[PDB]
Amino acid sequence: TEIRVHQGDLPNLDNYRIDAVAVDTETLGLQPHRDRLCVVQLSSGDGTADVIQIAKGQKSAPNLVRLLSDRDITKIFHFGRFDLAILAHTFGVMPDVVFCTKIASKLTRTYTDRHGLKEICGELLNVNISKQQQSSDWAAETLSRAQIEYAASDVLYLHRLKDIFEERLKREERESVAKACFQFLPMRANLDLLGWSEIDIFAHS
Amino acid sequence: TEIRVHQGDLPNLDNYRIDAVAVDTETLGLQPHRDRLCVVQLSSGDGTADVIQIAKGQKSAPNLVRLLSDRDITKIFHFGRFDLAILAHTFGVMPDVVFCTKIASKLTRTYTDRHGLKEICGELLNVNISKQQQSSDWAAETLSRAQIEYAASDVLYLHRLKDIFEERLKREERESVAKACFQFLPMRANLDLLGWSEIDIFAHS
Amino acid sequence: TEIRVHQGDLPNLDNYRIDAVAVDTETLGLQPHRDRLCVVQLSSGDGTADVIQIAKGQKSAPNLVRLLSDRDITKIFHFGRFDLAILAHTFGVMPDVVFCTKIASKLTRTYTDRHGLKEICGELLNVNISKQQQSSDWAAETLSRAQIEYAASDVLYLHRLKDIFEERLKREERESVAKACFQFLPMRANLDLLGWSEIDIFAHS
Amino acid sequence: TEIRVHQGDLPNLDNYRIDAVAVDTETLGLQPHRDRLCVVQLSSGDGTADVIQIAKGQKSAPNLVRLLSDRDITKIFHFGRFDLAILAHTFGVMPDVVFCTKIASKLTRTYTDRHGLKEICGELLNVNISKQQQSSDWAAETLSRAQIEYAASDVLYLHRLKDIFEERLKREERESVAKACFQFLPMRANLDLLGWSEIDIFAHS
Amino acid sequence: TEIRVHQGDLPNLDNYRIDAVAVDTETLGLQPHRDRLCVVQLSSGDGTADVIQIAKGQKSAPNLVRLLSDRDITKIFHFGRFDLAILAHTFGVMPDVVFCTKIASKLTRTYTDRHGLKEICGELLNVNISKQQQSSDWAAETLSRAQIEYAASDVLYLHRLKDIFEERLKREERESVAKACFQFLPMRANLDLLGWSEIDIFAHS
Amino acid sequence: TEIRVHQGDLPNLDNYRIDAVAVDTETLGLQPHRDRLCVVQLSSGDGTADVIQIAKGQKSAPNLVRLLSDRDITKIFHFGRFDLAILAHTFGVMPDVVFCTKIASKLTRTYTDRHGLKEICGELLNVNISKQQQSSDWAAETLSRAQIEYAASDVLYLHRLKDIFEERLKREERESVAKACFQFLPMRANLDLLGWSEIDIFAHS
Amino acid sequence: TEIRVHQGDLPNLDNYRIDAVAVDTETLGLQPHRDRLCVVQLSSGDGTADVIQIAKGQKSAPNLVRLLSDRDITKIFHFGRFDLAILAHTFGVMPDVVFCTKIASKLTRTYTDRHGLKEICGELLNVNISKQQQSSDWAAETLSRAQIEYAASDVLYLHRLKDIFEERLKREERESVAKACFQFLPMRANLDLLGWSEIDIFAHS
Amino acid sequence: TEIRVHQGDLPNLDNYRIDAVAVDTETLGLQPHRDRLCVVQLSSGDGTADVIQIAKGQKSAPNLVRLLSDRDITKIFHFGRFDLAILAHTFGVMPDVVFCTKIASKLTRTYTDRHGLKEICGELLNVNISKQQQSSDWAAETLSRAQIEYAASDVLYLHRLKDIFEERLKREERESVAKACFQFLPMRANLDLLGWSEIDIFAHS
């Protein structure tokens, strides 16, 4: 596996002239107002990944933000509700063309109640992702090799999952449901940033 | 107050050449697959209401459905998540231009945790709605006068609430949030009809 | 209202040559193995009631038990799961032709979650039953007038409820469901006596 | 072990001229209105099994339904409350002669609170069933060998369990209790289909 | 009603040459190690009461302690588990001849789940005790008249309750159960003082 | 009662040359990052109050902030954990000489579990505060008379409570405990602003 | 290890002329009114055990009951609350000289919250008891060797535990507390048989 | 590793002329009023430890208390809320210069919810601490070698953790927050001793 590690931003977009890009983030925690973005990982689906270390207080990443803003490229996330929130909070741009594997799983893998990425990758691809490094110091000046490999493992498989989930959504005739959910997901993330992160806005109570 | 009671459908749309119509329903319960639609109430905001008794097994109401399908007329609901579901299940047409006072309350009345219609009407208008008839036999062949007055009371005030809530949403700069929520609300109702009524599709667990 | 109070048993069955009899009990508590049967109340539906005081250790009541065993007479209960259990535990005979207003309410009053006798009588008949004496010393040698009137009030209305509930069950096409539930109710009561009173025998867990 | 895999239906009933047949199903989930029947497995108890793949939208399976409707053949299930519901929803025929190993376990294995099939098979027969494939894509056009073996393992042992449970029910004198529970089980399943799947119809609250 | 208010101790025992004395306490709270004893109330059952104000840091009350230690006099409490604990903690003497109306209620008033003193007095005697002053500053140098009347009301009726409860215990044949419970109650209070106040020492977990 | 209503700030500090000032706030809700400060109320303890309407986006209030920063003047709050947070978030100055009636109540009113301002005022002073206006639109351009009177009622009594609580703290020898709690309270509020509002920082879990 | 298996009763008491006997039971479940006594195991502490199979409906075991009734012999149990209940229910004799290792553990092993027999034996003696057979069919006509060895393992170590716990109770000065708890334990078991098995008779609620 | 075991007290302070000392305790349980201090462990950070056995009823340890009272030496704890309480309760001196690794973890390891010492040591240092002996008889006259090694393992690493946590607190700019928390920690422990151990003194409820 090829993992290219960068400081601050991509050098250029030569490797990301594609129709869909897998995106994930790492942070110091679950609360975007307290816990800063530390790492962004990207993959074109070609079996390689880019891992971009974000500096404390960094407000801009022009090449990355160009990728995030381009409406002709679908951004694939797992539980994008969080990643969209932290990305918009950090760089000020909210992506609006997204696919979320957690929503897709909840709309298709109706035979289980376990929708985490580890379980999805295990069941659909028989690939074992080890989550031991998920809780680690992502703000370290130098990431360990184990950290880098874990960070890359989170984007290496999202394209294959998207392909399978699109097949399942077509088979079970839920394409318009998923499309509407993905269309609303950026506003769910914005609501999270504004202060309703603990509130189901559509619930009766 | 003028309450016109009809059987099956409106006679015509002469009274509903307006930009927004208040809509509510009554049913035999909270589960659209088990509990049939029994009454539909409408108001143009002029202080009068129409109460339409729906027969068992009735599949069509052409004038009402014409109103519900007209994209130039905003349908105002309180907790439209339910009403949209039961209306689409009964007549096969899902409205797509809606305003929901419960979502608006949750986005604006942040100083309270009580978002029911009774509390909203009491606080915003100092009008006391009595909910005693909410749990009654709405499938009766002949509705009582108390039932008819209660049913009318649920639509008589939605226009005034919409006006106030639009003022609050503009004041607190949440118009685009509310618009996106209202745009997603019909798909939330469809998800309810399809079997995810007990599932927050965006939650981590 | 006419309330005839008896010691031990009915003098005869001259007043109970009817197709359905309303039955209720009072006890020292909810656990038949600890809490003895103290009072049995009966009504033919003619606006009068019989209140039979049961002595401590009494094992037999031949006229009452003749009524309870007669398969040509439907026994009407409210929450018969309990009354059947305590009656079978006390006299050794389990009725097998029953109607239960709580099951009927749960199968028909789907628009509410309150299925107690007070709420049913209030909604369906606009009659106010006062439950203040429900928790009182039913084992007293001499019952107070308030106790006797309360005990009679629990059977005076069950016929009218049965008539209305049968109308609702026919209207909503649930007659065979109710019939099967009533057929199983005596075995649910037997299961209670045998030790599964806290167990839903049909639940997954 | 011999596992015969069929498409749509049994070719004939030559192998099922027997007094009792073990039956199980697999679906896309726990909610019959959303989650379609995908596989039906059968065994005569001779150590072989039939696994029948059900197509999307299939409404009829005449040989299977003939077996399911024949009152002279007892259908053995584990947690038949679910299987009866999905079978009746799919093919329109509700079996009325059934035996359920979960009810039997709850009536006899009173020394444990674990009544799942894995635990029952482990304790009563010392046979280890692996449930890893229980949550898998049962709607796949081609089932994997592991899926087929898992599906067969669920019916291969129900006859032996029925024999042991009948011995236990006779020993502890609960035969009439079990018989009444099995008689009510199809109506419990019907109640599930009608919308009371989350309601204990006999509970006080 | 006659209420004699004393500072520190009774002047003598001339009024307490009796077979049973009603006893209650008031404190600054539910935790004897933090919340000091402030008032002790006594009654002989003759319709009069003594209310003894206890000073901060007071370690001795010889006449009161003589009464508390005399094994020929039954001390009547309501929820004596607490009063015994605070009395033993304050004066160093644990009474060993006691009657508790809460234990008696739980052993006899099996038809209710409300065993507080207010409910018992209301049901058994039709006397309304007002608990408004229960949460008040009992450490005040001068108690208000309302406080004094409330404090007296808690002992004025315990003799009558004891008489009725003894009748009920005899009637239901639970005398030896109650006697054993009362014999253990002082050790339950000691266990509370030693640090097991939140632990059911006899529970499995 | 004299209530002086101001826009933006006090005109001067001529009325607040005192040793302690009662302070309270009103907001659009419980979350300082979402819900802006709308009203600040002050009282010198002389039976009059000042009610200062804060404009949207207002960042400065020099006379008020001078009062809040003056270390020679004790700021009295009820549940100052919140008020300190919203004041520091709005004007950028955290008071460091405070008294909190909720902490004082929890350290002295150990005989009750109700520590709200209404209950404290009722018990200690026999004054009835009506909280009906607590949940109202505090951002209105013009406050109603009822709103103004409610806002003033929250500061009119804090001096008298402080006097009584200081007496109780001296009597029960908890002065150094209270002093340390008040010294830590501003940092508890800062922790709230930083993102630990839902976390007991000292708990084991 | 020597395990003597008997049918119905001990042949004689020649091996049980001792000051303390370890006692345990096995049943069909936790509810003495439903779940019959199946096995009784005894040990004198000499490293051997007696396992007595109890027949269905057996009402008498004269040698065993002689042992159970002899006040000069302490009966050692683990969680005797249950064993005393089932023994008294089966043979009609309640032991009144008992020692319970669960009460002793709760009074001495204050540094842990795990008081089960497995954990106690592991910690105090470094002996590993395997509980796999705890949930098995104890009513089988012929017990398996594994069942017999498990049943014997439950009494083989109670003497050593009693010795250690008596040392701990003396060291921490809790002997009179334990003695009072053991004195009350038979009445706690009687209360269980009478119907208060789910009630803490000493709790406030 | 060098572990020096002492009885009662250190012989002298020759090894503890340092700027910071790691401190931990072992007790008979979590409740200082019931569960006595049994062991105190200390380390200077040089890879050696002192383990001091405390006798029952011991009130003084002059050299240890001299160390605990010296304001020029920072005492490092893990969850010092407990250790401070038990130390002050036993020897009457409350340390006032402390560092707590649990507070530091909650202020810095925001990417996890597991703040126990085992997890911290595993993540930050890759050192595996085995907690098997945590629940053991610490009051034994002679500690086992395994107990001594476990007790030493709890102080051997606190200096390294303090160094890392100080780096993290500086990096994330939370030094003044941590300092204020550490300043309040002794009063939190005092509040625990006084009776508020189960109360969040700053919570609204």
The domain locations on chain D are 1-205
Tokens 């003759």 correspond to what residue? E46
Contact E5, E147 (CB under 8 A): no
B107 contacts in A (CB within 8 Å)? 201
Chain F residue numbers with beta carbons less than 8 Å from the beta carbon of H88 are: none
CA nearest to F192 within chain A: A34
Look at residues F78, F159, F85, F149 and name the one whose alpha carbon lies nearest to residue F119.
Answer: F78
Backbone angles phi, psi at H89, to 5 degrees: -65, -35
Q: What is the CA radius of gyration of chain A?
A: 16
Bridge partners of residue C21, in order along the sequence:
C75
Q: Cite the DSSP H helix spans in chain B.
A: 62-69, 80-91, 101-108, 117-125, 145-153, 158-171, 175-191
Contact C187, D177 (CB under 8 A): yes
Does the annotation place H173 within a ligand binding site? no
Encode burial over E6-28: b for 16+ CB neighbours within 10 A, e otherwise: beebbeeeebbebebbbbbbbbb
Chain D with chain G: Cβ pairs closer than 8 A = 18
Which contacts (CB < 8 Å, 24+ apart) does range H138-147 have?
A: H138/G111, H138/H26, H138/H27, H138/H28, H138/H38, H138/H39, H139/G171, H139/H28, H139/H36, H139/H38, H139/H56, H143/H5, H143/H39, H143/H51, H143/H53
State the amino acid at position G8 in one-letter form: G
Chains that touch A (3 or more CB pairs under 8 A): B, D, F, H
Which stretches of chain E sit within 8 Å of chain F by CB? 27-29, 31, 34-35, 135-139
Interface test with F, best of B105, B111, B120 (most F CBs within 10 A): B111
Q: After which residues is chain D broken (C to N over 2.5 A)?
A: none
Q: CA-CA distance, H17 to H21, in Å (whole number)?
A: 9
Nearest-Cα distance to chain C for G194, in Å, is 7
* Number of neighbours of residue F99 by Cβ within 10 angstroms: 24
Q: Is A204 annotated as a binding residue?
A: yes
In terms of residues, how long is chain G?
205
Element (H, E) at D94: none
- Alpha-carbon distance of A145 to E8, in angstroms, equals 76
For B78, phi then psi, to 5°, come to -110, 120
CB contact under 8 A, G203 and E200: yes
Give the residue from C30, C33, C199 with the most G CB atoms within 10 Å of its CB, the best one to mutate.
Answer: C33
SS percent in chain B: helix, strand, coil, step 5: 40, 15, 45
**Between chains, do B194 and D31 touch, taking CB under 8 Å as contact?**
no
Based on its alpha-carbon atoms, the radius of gyration of chain H, rounded to whole angstroms, reads: 16
What are H11's two structure tokens? 């012989």
Pairwise CB contact (< 8 Å): F188 & H202: yes
A154 assigned binding-site residue? yes
Taking contacts as CB-CB distances below 8 angstroms, the residues of chain H near G114 are: 135
Q: Is B112 helix (H, G, I), strand (E, B) or coil?
A: coil
Of E111, E123, E171, the CB nearest to C138: E111
Are E149 and E132 contacting, i.e. CB atoms less than 8 angstroms apart? no
Burial class (CB in 10 A: 0-12, 13-18, 19+), E170: exposed
| H63 within 8 A of H56, measured Cβ to Cβ | no
Name which of F159, F155, F137 is nearest F146 in CA terms: F137
Q: How many CB atoms lie within 10 A of CB H59?
A: 8
* The residue type at C84: L
Report how this structure was experimentally obtained. Answer: cryo-EM
Residues of G with a Cβ under 8 Å from any D Cβ are 27-29, 31, 34-35, 135-139
Q: How far apart are CA C12 and CA C61, in angstroms?
A: 11
E runs forming strands in E8-126: 20-27, 37-43, 48-53, 74-77, 98-100
Q: Which chain A residues are closer than 8 Å to H114 by Cβ?
A: 135
Cα dist from F176 to A68, E26, F170, H96, whole Å: 56, 27, 10, 14
* Nearest C-alpha in E relative to C141: E171
Q: Cα–Cα distance between H199 and H195 in angstroms, integer?
A: 9
Contacts of C27 (CB under 8 A, 6+ apart): C35, C36, C37, C38, C86, C138, E111
Annotated binding residue at G96?
no
Q: Do D136 and A171 touch (CB under 8 A)?
A: no
Q: Do B35 and C112 touch (CB under 8 A)?
A: no
Nearest in space to C202 (alpha carbons), one of E5, G17, A8, D184: D184
**Set of chain E residues whose Cβ sits within 8 Å of the Cβ of G169:** none
State the Cα–Cα distance between residues D96 and D101, nearest whole angstrom.
Answer: 16
Check if the beta carbon of residue G81 is closer than 8 Å to that of residue G100.
yes
User: Buried b / exposed e across C101-132, counting CB within 10 Å, b at 16+?
Assistant: bbbbbbbbbbbeeebbbebbbebbeeeebeee
Element (H, E) at E63: helix E62-69
Partners of residue D142 in chain A, C-beta under 8 Å:
none
- Distance between CA B85 and CA B94 in Å, rounded? 8
Judged by phi (left if over 0) then psi (alpha if -120 to 50, else beta), residue G33 lies in: alpha
For residue F74, CA distances in Å to B46, C199, F4, F23 come to 56, 61, 22, 10
Of D79, D174, D191, the CB nearest to C177: D191
Q: Which chain C residues contact residue G30 at CB under 8 A?
A: none
- Kindly give the pairing relationship between strand H20-27 and strand H37-43: antiparallel
CB C31 within 8 A of CB C23: no
Cβ pair E39, E138 in contact under 8 A:
yes
Query: Is B13 within 8 Å of B122 (Cβ atoms)?
Result: no
User: Does the beta-carbon distance from F111 to E136 stay under 8 Å?
Assistant: yes
In angstroms, the CA B93 to CA H163 distance is 66
| Closest CA relative to residue H116, chosen from H147, H154, H78, H81 | H78
**If you count residue pairs, one on A and one on B, with CB atoms under 8 Å apart, how many are there?**
54
Tokens of G147: 């069942």
Report yes or no: H83 and H60 within 8 Å, Cβ to Cβ: no
Nearest Cα residue to H192 out of H37, H27, H91, H80: H80
CA distance A147 to chain H (A): 13
B and H adjacent (3 or more CB pairs under 8 angstroms)? no
Q: Which of C31, C194, C195 is the closest to G195 by Cβ?
A: C31
Q: Tell whether C154 is in a known binding site.
A: yes
Q: What end-to-end distance do the CA atoms of chain A give, in Å?
A: 48
E126: left (phi over 0), alpha (psi -120 to 50) or beta: left
- Does G138 contact D114 at a Cβ distance shorter than 8 Å? no
Nearest by CB to residue E28, choosing from F110, F114, F123, is F110
Interchain CB distance below 8 Å, C194 and G31: no
Are B111 and F135 a contacting pair at CB < 8 A?
yes
Chains A and G are touching, with contact defined as 3 or more CB–CB pairs separated by less than 8 Å: no
Q: Is E61 within 8 Å of E18 (Cβ atoms)?
A: no
Question: Which of A103, A169, A188, A201 has the most B C-beta neighbours within 10 Å, making it the best mutation to test the interface with B?
Answer: A201
The one-letter amino acid at B186? P
Place of tokens 């009318």: B152
Identify the chains in contact with E, defined as 3+ C-beta pairs within 8 A.
C, F, G, H
Nearest to A68 by CA among A106, A22, A105: A22
**Any residues with CB less than 8 A from the CB of C119 and at least 6 apart, and which?**
C112
Contact B68, B87 (CB under 8 A): yes
* Contact status, residue E99 vs residue E76, Cβ threshold 8 Å: yes
- Is residue D130 within 8 A of residue D150, CB to CB? The reply is yes
- Cβ partners under 8 Å of residue C151, min gap 6: C24, C26, C39, C41, C49, C51, C133, C143
Query: Is residue B8 classed exposed, middle or buried when 0-12, 13-18 and 19+ CB atoms within 10 A define those classes?
Result: middle
Measured CB to CB, residues of chain A less than 8 Å from chain H are 27-29, 31, 34-35, 135-139
Nearest to D200 among C79, C177, C200 (CB): C200
The phi and psi torsions of E49 (rounded to 5 degrees) equal: -140, 155
CB contact under 8 A, G110 and H138: no
SS (H, E, C) chain H: CEEEEEECCCCCCCCCCCCEEEEEEEECCCCCCCCCEEEEEEECCCCEEEEEECCCCCCCCHHHHHHHHCCCCEEEECCHHHHHHHHHHHHCCCCCCEEEHHHHHHHHCCCCCCCCHHHHHHHHHCCCCCCCCCCCCCCCCCCCHHHHHHHHHCCCCHHHHHHHHHHHHHHCCCHHHHHHHHHHHHHHHHHHHHHHCCCCCCCCC
Interface test with H, best of E30, E33, E86, E192 (most H CBs within 10 A): E33
Q: Which of C106, C114, C88, C99 is nearest to C162 (CA)?
A: C99
> How many beta carbons lie within 10 A of that of residue G123, not counting itself?
18
Mutation target to probe the F interface, by most F beta carbons within 10 A, among A28, A33, A36 is A33
